[PDB]
Amino acid sequence: SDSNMLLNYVPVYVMLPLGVVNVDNVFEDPDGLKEQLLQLRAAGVDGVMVDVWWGIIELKGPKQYDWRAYRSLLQLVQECGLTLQAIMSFHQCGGNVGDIVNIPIPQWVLDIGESNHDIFYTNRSGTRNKEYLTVGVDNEPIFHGRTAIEIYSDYMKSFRENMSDFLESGLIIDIEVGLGPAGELRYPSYPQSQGWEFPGIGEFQCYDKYLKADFKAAVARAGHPEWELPDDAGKYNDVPESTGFFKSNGTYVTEKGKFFLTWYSNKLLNHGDQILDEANKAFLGCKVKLAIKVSGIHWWYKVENHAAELTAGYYNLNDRDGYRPIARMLSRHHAILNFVCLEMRDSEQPSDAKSGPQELVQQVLSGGWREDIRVAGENALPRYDATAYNQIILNARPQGVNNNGPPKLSMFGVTYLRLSDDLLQKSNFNIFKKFVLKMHADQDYCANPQKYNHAITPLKPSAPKIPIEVLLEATKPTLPFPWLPETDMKVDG
Ligand SMILES: OC[C@H]1O[C@H](O[C@H]2[C@H](O)[C@@H](O)[C@@H](O)O[C@@H]2CO)[C@H](O)[C@@H](O)[C@@H]1O
Ligand SMILES: OC[C@H]1O[C@H](O[C@H]2[C@H](O)[C@@H](O)[C@@H](O)O[C@@H]2CO)[C@H](O)[C@@H](O)[C@@H]1O
């Protein structure tokens, strides 16, 4: 049982509290965090995840980085016997679910935004979302001579060099490369800041002047210079059948609508690819893996228009796989797909949301495995209950434990949202400890990940670029891998 069981081990990470380093670049409560981290260590947790906030670190001005508070944080994590998942967080904290602290992007960038409002994702009404720089400015040299991708590149390089000792020592297991709002490769199509409420369809975020011009040039090249961006897609809180765009036989299935949706979703593929190229250059030779985050847009998954996925930039339909192209893009970077809505069951969602989180998880994970990449995940919402943990464990090993060897299917890791005093209360923490144990296939905590075939080797160069047509060959629908109806390693087991 034991070593066969150890090859079934799926590591568990815990997100740190938001604002552990505050907006003033102060590590405010090391002593309190220490006590919490030592509890996690004794509970068997493998490591922790933290946002390395751009708006904290590069606040003073371009290339004026202050890494000192984060060095103190990393030092503490190391002392407490935990590894670290470091998010390169190029986004704002404050306007998404659960955000309890306010960390804008650097003021010097916002200053440029006051003169050029088109550096922000923009909806049809003209509202500027300041949480992330539009993909439109990725390669526009408008930030005191740098492009947005150069900013991100320079930041990652500075992190790699200034944290070189922690990297060499093996503290950092993965670099989560932030690619949009909430760190995710997506558009801000469901902004609470503009009055969105679940389960609204959301809105397309491509009306900044850079994206609009790019679209207009592309439709002209396609022989349709008169095509305009969608004007019949409704508003954030609509339902799909209320809109010309998403109704049955609506604009989304027309040649115009299909072209738009392809263009819009391709912008994210290319944004992720180009930024991961820079991440690979920055961390070349380091014993880390790269990861990206994919949001779980489960509402409207069960209707043919998938409207909320579409407005988020995931062009996923019943007959078009919008996620497997992302997995294929990751393959050349040897990168992890971290899918950030892992814990849900369909029965938890209201019927009117047409919500399919179980099936969405199965689709995304299956696509990653079909494309021979590693797949990780997170719970979306705070959960302390056995139903949630058993669903996570199911997704972690969807065909169960292999008593005879490694499992044919397993996730590469799960990161739990989030460390809080509530997690550490007696009953909640007791159930969490059982979750960890079952994720670990009933084995004790295993400090050396080589033992469970998660050795960390130096980051190699990315493989050659994959052209967009080859990436989009992965839109071909495929059957998912079969899932058990329940895990064989329940917490109450
Ligand atoms: O980008 C943030 C977060 O958005 C989604 O979370 C949803 C959640 O699934 C809904 O049930 C509801 O609570 O609204 C949340 C958004 O405010 C994604 O599911 C998640 O993956 C992503 O991190
Ligand atoms: O600290 C990580 C990340 O947390 C929040 O975003 C979450 C979202 O709340 C979830 O639903 C989840 O599992 O995925 C997102 C990505 O981890 C903050 O909103 C975000 O700013 C922060 O980076």
Side-chain angles (χ1 to χ4, degrees):
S1 241
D2 265 329
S3 331
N4 273 354
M5 294 296 283
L6 192 51
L7 287 161
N8 290 262
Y9 181 118
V10 180
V12 176
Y13 309 93
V14 175
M15 301 187 188
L16 299 188
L18 295 172
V20 281
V21 176
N22 74 22
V23 71
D24 293 332
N25 212 350
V26 175
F27 180 16
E28 318 201 1
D29 188 9
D31 293 335
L33 186 64
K34 178 177 180 159
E35 282 326 294
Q36 293 179 314
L37 294 178
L38 289 170
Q39 291 204 144
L40 297 185
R41 176 66 290 116
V45 170
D46 298 280
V48 295
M49 178 185 278
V50 72
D51 290 281
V52 187
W53 295 106
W54 177 37
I56 298 177
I57 302 300
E58 202 183 358
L59 186 52
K60 185 69 185 169
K63 292 186 161 190
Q64 286 186 277
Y65 311 107
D66 174 16
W67 299 110
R68 294 172 299 158
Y70 274 89
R71 285 190 58 81
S72 298
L73 174 62
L74 271 56
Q75 179 67 36
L76 179 58
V77 174
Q78 178 178 267
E79 286 165 2
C80 294
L82 288 154
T83 57
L84 179 67
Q85 302 181 116
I87 315 162
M88 305 294 96
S89 296
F90 296 115
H91 61 281
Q92 170 183 273
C93 196
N96 289 308
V97 60
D99 292 355
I100 54 118
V101 302
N102 301 309
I103 306 169
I105 74 177
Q107 182 62 49
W108 65 265
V109 174
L110 295 175
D111 289 343
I112 292 168
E114 283 309 309
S115 302
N116 186 168
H117 295 169
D118 295 288
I119 72 173
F120 302 122
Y121 284 126
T122 302
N123 75 337
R124 188 179 166 76
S125 300
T127 307
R128 313 298 187 161
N129 185 337
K130 300 192 192 190
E131 75 184 309
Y132 187 81
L133 295 175
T134 176
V135 53
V137 297
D138 276 358
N139 298 301
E140 291 286 346
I142 64 173
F143 302 102
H144 305 294
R146 287 193 295 167
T147 71
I149 290 181
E150 286 168 343
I151 297 173
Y152 304 151
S153 187
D154 290 342
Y155 183 94
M156 291 188 285
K157 180 181 178 184
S158 183
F159 181 88
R160 180 258 181 83
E161 293 176 356
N162 285 283
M163 306 306 192
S164 60
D165 51 345
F166 296 118
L167 286 155
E168 176 58 11
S169 75
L171 179 66
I172 304 173
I173 185 208
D174 68 64
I175 304 300
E176 305 265 329
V177 177
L179 292 170
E184 292 160 335
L185 181 59
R186 67 183 182 82
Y187 294 96
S189 51
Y190 50 102
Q192 288 182 171
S193 60
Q194 297 178 220
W196 174 89
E197 301 184 17
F198 178 88
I201 61 175
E203 295 181 21
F204 294 120
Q205 300 294 137
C206 50
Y207 296 86
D208 76 70
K209 82 179 180 182
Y210 298 100
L211 288 180
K212 188 188 289 36
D214 177 329
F215 168 83
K216 285 304 286 185
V219 299
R221 291 190 305 276
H224 305 273
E226 79 284 1
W227 280 353
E228 304 283 358
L229 291 172
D231 64 8
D232 61 349
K235 295 201 153 247
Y236 289 116
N237 301 142
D238 281 320
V239 301
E241 60 276 24
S242 70
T243 68
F245 192 86
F246 299 111
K247 68 182 180 175
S248 183
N249 292 332
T251 303
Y252 77 113
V253 296
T254 66
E255 190 151 89
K256 178 187 154 183
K258 292 183 291 183
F259 183 94
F260 165 74
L261 289 164
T262 303
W263 167 89
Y264 184 70
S265 58
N266 286 172
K267 295 307 286 176
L268 296 181
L269 292 170
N270 290 328
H271 175 73
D273 196 32
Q274 294 166 22
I275 295 165
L276 284 167
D277 278 335
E278 298 304 310
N280 179 70
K281 286 174 192 166
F283 291 101
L284 193 65
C286 295
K287 297 165 188 166
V288 299
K289 294 190 180 18
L290 302 184
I292 71 160
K293 303 199 185 193
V294 177
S295 183
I297 312 297
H298 55 81
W299 53 107
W300 311 106
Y301 183 95
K302 292 198 164 199
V303 294
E304 63 186 316
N305 46 265
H306 293 256
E309 287 163 276
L310 270 56
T311 60
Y314 303 137
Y315 185 17
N316 188 55
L317 296 171
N318 296 349
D319 56 2
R320 186 191 193 279
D321 192 326
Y323 304 102
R324 199 170 59 106
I326 300 170
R328 184 166 291 184
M329 179 278 288
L330 296 175
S331 71
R332 71 187 266 252
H333 301 287
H334 313 107
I336 300 157
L337 195 167
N338 173 186
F339 186 73
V340 307
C341 187
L342 200 62
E343 77 290 8
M344 300 187 172
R345 293 189 61 82
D346 293 9
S347 67
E348 299 168 350
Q349 296 296 156
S351 54
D352 67 13
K354 293 292 173 168
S355 157
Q358 295 169 247
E359 293 89 346
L360 174 61
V361 167
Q362 173 181 225
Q363 182 187 345
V364 172
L365 273 49
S366 290
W369 296 328
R370 179 63 171 252
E371 292 297 311
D372 196 21
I373 68 159
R374 298 174 190 71
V375 181
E378 302 170 2
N379 57 302
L381 301 179
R383 297 286 292 272
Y384 304 106
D385 60 285
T387 296
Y389 292 129
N390 289 338
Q391 185 62 199
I392 295 165
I393 296 157
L394 177 53
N395 287 325
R397 288 188 298 267
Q399 295 178 173
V401 296
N402 181 194
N403 256 3
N404 321 309
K408 174 191 71 194
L409 305 174
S410 63
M411 296 181 68
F412 198 66
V414 175
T415 313
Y416 176 87
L417 183 160
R418 186 187 289 290
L419 179 56
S420 41
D421 307 348
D422 283 345
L423 177 60
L424 299 181
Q425 297 319 122
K426 184 167 173 211
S427 288
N428 288 343
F429 204 47
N430 276 350
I431 307 164
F432 181 81
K433 280 176 259 180
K434 296 173 171 154
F435 166 64
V436 170
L437 175 64
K438 297 306 160 179
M439 290 289 287
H440 291 175
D442 275 347
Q443 305 309 291
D444 288 353
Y445 163 68
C446 184
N448 187 351
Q450 190 176 321
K451 291 179 175 178
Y452 56 87
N453 199 7
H454 279 42
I456 57 260
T457 62
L459 188 67
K460 310 268 112 238
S462 300
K465 269 259 219 225
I466 304 165
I468 190 65
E469 331 78 66
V470 176
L471 293 177
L472 297 188
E473 291 171 6
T475 60
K476 178 176 295 188
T478 49
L479 301 175
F481 295 86
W483 248 240
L484 287 169
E486 65 187 6
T487 184
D488 57 349
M489 297 291 283
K490 294 180 181 197
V491 294
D492 12 36

